[PDB]
């Protein structure tokens with residue numbers, strides 16, 4: 001509370017992402033004055049056009065206070081969250097957003113799987129799992145919405161985009177990817193659901209899950225999908 005609100009506000013409004021993040025964390029611990037600065041920043045930046053990590057971090061930091069008035073104000077002003085909930089198939093992404101805004105990552109993971117089957121159409125909806133060719137033909141827009149929500153509500157630590165970047169970093173070697181994202185530990189495949197880490201202590205890329213029971217083809221088709229380069233992920 002001895003921190004300088006004028007200077008922290010300026011740090012948030014400057015263009016350095018790394019300095020924005022430290023300012024946001026400090027401001028959120030500075031009562032009405034700091035929280036008011038954060039609320040004004042949201043008001044000036046929402047709805048997003050492109051995903052902006054700092055804006056997601058402001059929203060989620062404020063939600064995570066779990067204080068009545070701020071929660072009420074965020075829900076009234078941003079009833080669908082901070083990012084347009086767009087779909088090439090008219091799908092409803094609000095339940096996914098709500099789970100993510102509550103930091104209920106396990107529910108969000110379950111919803112994401114249901115939505116991908118819905119997106120793939122009647123065959124996938126009935127069998128409740130995907131073929132790699134269905135993934136290849138997903139519309140980019142829906143994948144962008146889904147990924148943006150995961151990324152914005154996890155400080156950039158979750159999302160298929162995050163997994164893709166780690167997969168590229170590993171030379172596209174899936175056997176190196178699994179330990180990096182916590183899906184295998186040496187010889188031990190992480191058991192679903194109890195072995196997974198349903199919070200932000202999880203490794204980067206841990207969520208959303210892609211079951212490996214039917215092999216890696218779905219994951220590879222997802223990571224190679226044109227959406228990522230199209231939207232700058």
Ligand SMILES: C=CC1=C(C)/C(=C/c2[nH]c(/C=C3N=C(/C=C4\NC(=O)C(C)=C4C=C)C(C)=C\3CCC(=O)O)c(CCC(=O)O)c2C)NC1=O
Pocket residue numbers: 113129183184189190191192209210211212213214
């Ligand atoms: C490679 C070993 C591996 C095994 C033995 C495995 C088994 C497995 N995973 C399941 C579900 C599931 N398993 C996962 C995810 C995982 N589960 C894991 O063991 C791992 C490593 C992940 C990776 C994220 C998910 C999300 C489900 C529920 C969705 C689905 O049934 O596809 C089921 C239940 C299928 C059913 O009831 O119809 C089995 C038998 N999955 C695997 O990937």
